[model samples]
Structure formats: C-alpha cells, structure tokens
Target chain A: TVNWSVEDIVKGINSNNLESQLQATQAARKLLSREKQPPIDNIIRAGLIPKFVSFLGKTDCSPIQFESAWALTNIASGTSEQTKAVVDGGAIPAFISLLASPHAHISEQAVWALGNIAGDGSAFRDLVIKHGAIDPLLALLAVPDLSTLACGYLRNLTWTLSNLCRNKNPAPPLDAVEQILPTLVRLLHHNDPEVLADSCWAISYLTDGPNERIEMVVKKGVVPQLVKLLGATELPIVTPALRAIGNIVTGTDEQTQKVIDAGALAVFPSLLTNPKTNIQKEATWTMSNITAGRQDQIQQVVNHGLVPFLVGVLSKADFKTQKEAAWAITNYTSGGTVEQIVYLVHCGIIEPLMNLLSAKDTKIIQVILDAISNIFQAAEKLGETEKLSIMIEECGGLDKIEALQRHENESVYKASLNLIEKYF
Target chain B: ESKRVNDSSPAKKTRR
Candidate 1:
C-alpha cells in the first residue's frame, strides 16, 4: 500500500523538503513489509546498503535522516539477516560519525540505532567497540541536557552487555562489566527518574548471574538505596526498586532479613492498596521473595492484614492483579503455620485461588501450588478443624464461607495427601 | 574538541 520508492524517499530527503521527506520515509518503511524475501536479501547484497548508510550523515536538519534512522533501527534490530545488511552497508561508521554531530536529536538517534544494531551478536560489535562507544555513552550519563534520550541509549547498551554476558558461548569480557559498574552507579543519581529506575533494573540484572560482582554491588550500599527508592514518591521508581530488592534477597537468608529489616514488610503491604495495580503486582513480588523462608516475617505480614488485602486484590483487581496476589500469598505461606493458613482461608481467599488452577501461565500455577503447600503445612501444625473452624467463624463465620475443594497437578495432589493425613 | 563540562560551576552551585 506504500506509494513511494526508496529513490523517491532519498530524493525528497536531498531536496530539503521536510514534509515530503517525512511522508516518503514513512511510505518506504511501510513498503518494507510488501517486499519479497529474496529481493530484500538481494537489495542488501547489492550496493543499496551504502546509499542507506549515507542518509545517516545527511545533516540538513530535515526529518528525512531521523525517519530513516528510526526505520533502520526497526529493520536492523528485527532480524539477523537485516542486521547483517545494515552492518555491511557501513552503518557502523556512519552511525558513529553522527555521535559527534552538533545536532543533539540526531546524535541521540544515531547512538540508539548503533546500540540496537550492535546488540545483535553477528552485527558490527568490533566496529562499534573500536570506535569507543562506551565513553560517549558514559559521558551521556553525565549530560543533563538530554538525560531522557541518553538514558535510553544507556539502557540499550547495558541490555546488550547483559545478553553478551549471558550467552552460552565464550561470555563477554569481564573488564567491560567492571568498567561500566561505576558509571552505572553514577547514573543512579541522575535527575531523571526513568533513568534512575532503568539503571537500577540494568544493574540488578548485570549482577545476578555472577556472584563475584554481585558482592561489589552489595558492598556499594545498593540495597539501602534500592529500599529507599521502593518508598519513593514516584511510581516509576517503585516497581524497579521492588525488582531490584527481589533479586538482592533471592538465595540468601541474610540478605532476605536485611530487606525485611529495611522496612520492606511495612512498605510493600501499603503498596497493595495503591490505586495502580502494576505497583501492587511489583510490591507483591517483593513480599513473596522476602518471606520465602522466614515464617516469623510471614506471620508479621499476616498480622499486618496482608491476607485480607491480598484477597481483596484478587477478587476486585484484573487478571494480572489476581495472579500476582495469588503468587505472593503462595510464597508468603510456604512452610508456614496452620494459624496463618486458616487466616488466609478465613479471609475468603480460597474460591478465587481455586479458579486460577486453570490459568495458562505456568509460573502462576507454580505459585498457586506453592501457596497450597503452605496452607496444608500450617493446617497440619495447628491440628484439627474445630480450632480452624472457630478461627474462621470468629474472623467472619461460616455464613460468609465458600467451601471450594479443588486440586490440579502433582503438587496440588501432594498437598491433598498431606491434608488427608492431618484432618481426615 | 570541547573540554568535558564539569557540574561544579559557581552559578550552578548556588541553586534554590
């Protein structure tokens, strides 16, 4: 359905007609969808690649080059095949050259394009690294003029490095991670909250796979700052802060308690009642991880009325809300007391939880089973329905009770087996 | 090339 050719787009660009140039560029991007596979490959194999790369340096302040850069990023980053074409087209040099241009917008777009293209392992990593992209990106971290644009490029670059480190092949060099950590820490204080949030996310991911560097992050007092950001007035900071805390507490009892002592239990339950469900979901995940092995903290959370709020979230919120609340309840209750299990059931959490047994998301089902395990363990510890029934009736009584017996999968089956052993 | 701009300018320091 596109009406323009690449030549028409390029001519409109060179003619300095901004409107026509933008229109034609948009048309050409749409045309990419209509092109057949082999011809697209042939177009790249031929010399049209150089012509495309030349547009990256067209500094006429026309929207043509910017549109072209945007289109090129989508194409080059979309597939390995298109990535090779852009790289072979001398995209690396042309993009790097634009990094120093007087125009701030163009320079930022160019950096973003380069970062996206270089993210593909087979593309021009050598060329981009050789041209010294790391310093420019780090310098952008300190540039207050265009913090938003710069932060986007920084996040992309950090993601690329993370992918490299995670690759099954010869992992990316360790020195790069070491060099970037301090810069990343510096950006944590950027005036932009989005930048600060994403930097927190990137640093959390970067440190997760390797224990050696994770300690460095912990030593830098990242956890307390993360906890502080969890209680930040800004909504954007809250989710990432929760994610960072979850990562910090995983696989370590000491770190888990540190998070709890840092006021996670107090802060996260309050977030459940936030007007935004996404924040509630993030808060639930943080609570789940922190209470993973700690029964005392789980009871504290329960005593704070977390179960009723979580049940409220399940019944009133959307699908994601119900799912995350279920997982959080499951994780918190794992290996917990019978009193706590009865508390959750008495809070009217059972029916909605049973409804989620048919959810397609495997992780959701896993957490549901985990919550059931905790419920059974707690019931076993309390020993007998008379007490549980009394607790339930006192919490609200049987008139409000909805008895729903449901079981799915082996874990749920085992939970039933345990319940039969205790109550029957 | 221009020197790297530091954040320590005197005017920048006396913000409200």
Candidate 2:
C-alpha cells in the first residue's frame, strides 16, 4: 500500500503486463473504497477511469472485472460531473453486459455501479434502460435461489430497481415497466428495510404514471403488503411505502378502494400526527384523493374518524400541509352525504377552514369558496341552513365569506356571490 | 335555485 502512489497505481493498471495490471487495479479499488474521504477527485484526475472501464471488459478475469467495476461504482457515486466522466468513459454497456456474468460478486458490483449511474438523474436513468438493463435485472430477481442472496446483495438489487423506476420527466418504458412488476411485487415481501424501501420506491415510481400502470402493480397483489409496511418502524420503509400507497390512491375509485380495503385508512391518523411534516403532508395528500372518490369512500374517511385530524391539520400545519388537508375537507364537503357534512361541521372543521379564505393563493381561496358553497348546499338539503349559518357567524367565517365578494379572481367572486345570495 | 357544480379533482400524486 505504501509503495503505490496514485500515479503508480494508474501506471500499473495501464501496463500491458497482466499481473502488474491486476495489482494496480486492486490498489486503486482499495484506495477508492476508503470510508472516510476516499480521494475520488484525485483518482479521476489521474486518468484511471478509462483504465478501470477497460478492465471491466476483462471477462476472463473476474478479479480484474470485479475490482474495476468496484472502482467505477465508487467513482460514479461522486459528484454529477464525476458520474458523467464514468458514463463518458463508456462504462454503462460494460456494466450491462456484466449483469449476466455468472460470477455473483461481479454482477452484484455491476448492479451497484449501474445504480449509481441511474441515480444521477433522469437522462442516465433512461440511458441505463436503453442499454437493455431491465431484462437481466428482472431475471436476477426471478432466480430460484434468491433466498441465498446475502442481505447486501438483495439490498443493492432492489435499490438498483428503484433508481431505474425513479424520475418521471419520461417515466421508464411501459413495456420495461411491465416486465419488472412481478419481480417488484415479489421483492416487497423481503424482511430487510433497505430492500423493502427500495421495492416500495420502485412501485411508487411505476405507479407514479398512468392508472394503467398503477393497475399493473395492483393486479400483482402488492397493495395489502404495502399497507402493512405503513406500520413499519423505520422512516425509510414507511416513507416510500406511504408514497407508493399515495400513488395507488391516485388511481380510479376501484383502485383507490384496493388501498382503502387493505386498511390504509386505519394508518392515517397516526401518519397525520407524525412529527415529520413531509409524512404529514403526504398522508394528508393521500387522504385528499380518497375523499375525492365516491360517497362510500368519503363515508369511510368519516367512519375511520379522520375528520377532526384533517381539521386539526388545517388549523395547525404549514401552508403546504394545510393545503392538502384543505383539499380533503373541501372534497368531502363537495361529495359527502348530508349527515356526513353535518358531522364535518360538528367536528369543528369550519373555523380552521375559514381562516384560509384570506390566503394569498387564489387556488386555495377558490377551493375554499367551492367548499363553503357545498356546505351551504348540504345544509339546504338537511334543512339546517340556519344552524350552519350560526356556526359560520360564531367563527367569524360569515364575515370573511362576505368579504370575498369583492376579490379580483372571477371564480372566487362568483362563488362568494352565490353563497351570499342563496343563504345569507 | 339552480345547484352549483363543484369540481372535486382526485388526490395529488407524489414523486421521489
């Protein structure tokens, strides 16, 4: 180790002499693999990247192939420019070809390297898939002896699957997406948190697109397991699980019902109270979609006792979180049964909701106007208009509603006008 | 009085 300067290591790998070359590559790999500040920038400056890429093609030498890939994987994990250097060094096809290498360690390193490339961003993600990585990646998951895979191997495999499935500017190809759904659903059952998180993330990205794609995941029986993951103690596990479930609920009412039926509603109260605001925001956002479904679905939200919490979020959360909770309450108002509307009003949803009417976001004001109108309409249906009016007055909401009439936004003005003329 | 139509769009989608 003392004898090997960065230049010496590069020269050794650059040598035509095979023994010297392997030793140099091993030295390079060891140096790059350092946990505390491995000299990634310095190594790249030494012109070792192309040499490492050349070594990846030495299929007859698993030692060299694995070491070079191991080195490249570390380099790819560096800054975006460094990752680009590895890509420009033409490492992707080499990595793709080695995914088929019968040598378990070599293939695993290749998967690790590709994951780093794919995670860089959307373009490289597309580049990796375009190189035909999806089929072999799916094949690795399908092998009968997967239980024999070490936890690290399984973790990297699922994580690589996740990077491929992430980034949505142009989502992964639908045909490629179809090929991986079965394997993704299978990986969801892994006991490891790392594996489970990535598996759920992959499912989240896959479902992030069309309803047709979400149906692709749902038909695989992944929903119930995903709901189970919601209760996992790890944030990494729960966050992606929440995201995937959030995406699933974005599907059609029937698909949304699959998540609801899996007992996802039982999990939201706790999630809404989660200290992490993002978790709270996502849970509320997911709930907003649920409320947007049919009467039966809205009733389930009520039955699960989430109304007060939604109202609570509206009162206390920051604007982004409040926006989601607002949507849930507004959608509920728009579609709830008369009794449900009354329950929402009784739950004290009016005061916090009204506080948002003066919000600067015109969209929020518009939706709030729509919700107020729906509540009034629901009151009319229930023959309780006077009682609803009293609550709005008590909360000072009636004054705000009256004030919105002069608002510049056409829809807000019209909505306020309708509410005032019809009820006040 | 004519009942007003309200637009209730579905849930917001999340991306990683």
Candidate 3:
C-alpha cells in the first residue's frame, strides 16, 4: 500500500518474512509492468534479474517463484537492452529449470520469460536452446490439458519453443529441435487461437527447414492442422499456415500429396482470393510447389481449378508472388502430360505466360519461355496447334517471343528462339 | 536457414 523505494523493495525481497517477500515481488512487478521506461530502468538498475532468478530456485514457496519469474517475464518483454540485461544476468538456465516445476504458475511464468527473451532475437534464443530448454519446453505439450492453467501455459510454452526454433543468424541444428515434431503436431489441434498461432510458428519454423525435417513434420500429421489453420482469421496463423503449406508441398511427391490428402486443396481457392496479400503470396507459393512435382501432382493442381488463379497471380501480386505463380505453370507444362498442358492452355495460361516475356526478371522470362515451349510441344503432339496458334496470336505470344529473341541476354534469347522455332 | 534454403532459385531480380 506504500510507495516503496527500490531499496525498500530489494530489502523486503531479502527479508526473512514470507509476507515481506511476496509484497516486495508484487511491488516490483507493478512498477516493472507499466508502459513507462523509468520503472523498468529502475528495476534493471537494481540488478534484480539474477536476484529473481535466485528466487526461482526457492523451493519453499510457489508464489515467490511465480512472482519472481513473472517479474522477469515483464522485464524481458521490455526494450532489447533491458531484455539483454536478463540474458546477460544468466537468468535463462534458471528460467528453463523452473519449467519442470510442479507448480503450474511457476512453470508457466518461466516459459513466459523465455518467450519474451527468445522473441528479443536469435542470440537470446540460442541461449534458451543452448541451456537445454528444448526437450522440457516440448515436454510441456505432454500435459493432458494445455488449457489447464487458464491463460494456457501451453500457449506461452509453445511460443517460447517456436521462437527458440525460429532463430535466423544460425538456427538450432535439428538434432535437438527435431524432438519437437511429435509434440508440436499434437498441439496443432489445441483450441486456443493464441496457442494455435504459436504452434503454427513452431511448425513453420520446422517446415521451413530441410526436406527431412519438412517430411517429418508432415509425417507427424502437421498438414491437416496446417490446412485448418489456413482458414484462421488471425493473420499470424494464416500467414505461417500458408508458408508451412508452401514448405510442405516442396517435399517428395507423396509428401506433397499428404497435404492434398489432408484437404488443403479445398481451402486453397479461398486463400488465393483471401483479402491479405501475404496470404495470397504464400498460397500461390504452395501451389507452385505442388506443381513442381511429377505430372500426376501437377495434374492435381490443375484439377483443383487453381490454374486460373495462378494465371492471375502471375500477372499481379508482388514480384515474388508472380514468380511463384509463373513457376507453378512452368512446372506443369514441363513435366505434365499432354492433356495437363492442354488443360492449362484452355484455362488461359497462354496470355499470363506470354505476359512475362516482357518482365525484367530473366528467370521469369526464361520460365515463361520454357512453359510456352512445353505448351507448343504438347500442342503439336495433340494436334491442337491450330487452337494454340489462335490463343498465342490473341495474347501476342509469338510476337513477344520474337521480340524477346533479340534481347541482350543470350540464354533468354536462345530460349525465345527455341520457342519460336518449335511451332511457328 | 530454411527460409534461405527454400528460396534457392539463384536468379537475381531488380528491387521493388
């Protein structure tokens, strides 16, 4: 009830009385939790982080541990410099050790601190992993109810784990991180959006990994949950879900099909037309990966009525989105059976592919050429050159290639020349 | 690592 000095609070924390200790922690928490900078700076200047970390090792009182860990969580949630104070104080291992505490509040608050620290950046995150936080964090999913601690201890734990797995300077090598797959996949069905969002991050982090890891997440049934997350209203969930699916489809043919088997195709049309631009880009990317597989898989994408949207995506969206869309059609044309290529042609890929000939990206211009070249080859085989010739003329396909033929880049010029010589 | 690994197209493009 009194406005205590930082000295008073610290002395109270060091006091022998439980009442004084709890009051001291609460006072510090109240000050540090504010939006103001001075309180946080005051708390940090008191060198309280390691003191709180010491309180976490207090086996005598759960409230002490909870309040101590909670205060540090807020402190870690402050400015990067402030969070680094927590990291530099060597509080991470103690925070991690508390994760195994039987007290739900204590363990959850520890994870809360870890999440904010991990969210600070890769250096802090690697410390979390380096201190052997991975297995225990992933182990939290073993709790029968993630909804157990009201705010979902499981939610904070997953976010912390996600952030740990998400480092960029040098990501955690898979030896320890891969252990999260079976558990992470299980939480994919957790009911809370916050939990779901964080779980999606964990999945996308692994999904964005090498092929074996991607396939493993898929093997753990990450796809269907990912598909469910695609329709989530939260932008965080939607975009990561979209990107994970993009990563999933990049796997082996059967691995890619597991996503389709999980019903991603049903939700994909909506993602293509989704209001968010990032969602559109990732969805196009996933579709592009799907088409990159064998003929049957490319046929699968075409059969899903995604071709028309890919045609649109190639013409619009951002540079990356257009390249992905172009790549999808290009893959389908190059590896697809004659009927699949013809199917794409009638779906109106000719103009979209033709449109890219003028693109400044030589890679796009080249893929567009490869796609057209494939289409012409397929058309000639099917005796559909008459139809092909009509569509190309309507889209100025031949003229673009003819103009592209004289372009400065020799490879693009050669590609253009090959397309012109093919069916003209 | 995978974000970089995933975007392995190796082709350069102009800025947006």
DockQ scores of the candidates: 0.02, 0.04, 0.04
Give TM per candidate: 0.64, 0.87, 0.81
In candidate 2, list every pair of residues with a backbone clash: A289-B11
Worst 10 residues of 1 chain A by lDDT: A396-405
Which candidate leads in DockQ?
3
TM-score of chain A of each: 0.66, 0.90, 0.83
Return the top candidate by lDDT: 2
iRMS values in order, in angstroms? 21.5, 12.4, 14.1
Tens-digit lDDT track of model 1 for A275-338: 7767776565555555565678677777666777778777767677777677667766664566
Best by TM-score: 2
Model 2 vs. true fold: TM:
0.87
Off by over 4 Å in 3: A1-28, A36-46, A58-67, A78-82, A100-103, A120-126, A130-143, A168-175, A231-236, A315-319, A382-390, A405-410, A417-424, B1-16
Give the alpha carbon lDDT tens digit for every residue of A200-312 in model 3. 77777777766787766776766777888887877877877877788777767787888888878878778887777777777877787777777777766777887888877
CA RMSD, predictions in order? 10.3, 5.5, 6.1
**Interface CA root-mean-square deviation for model 2:** 12.4
TM-score rank, highest first? 2, 3, 1
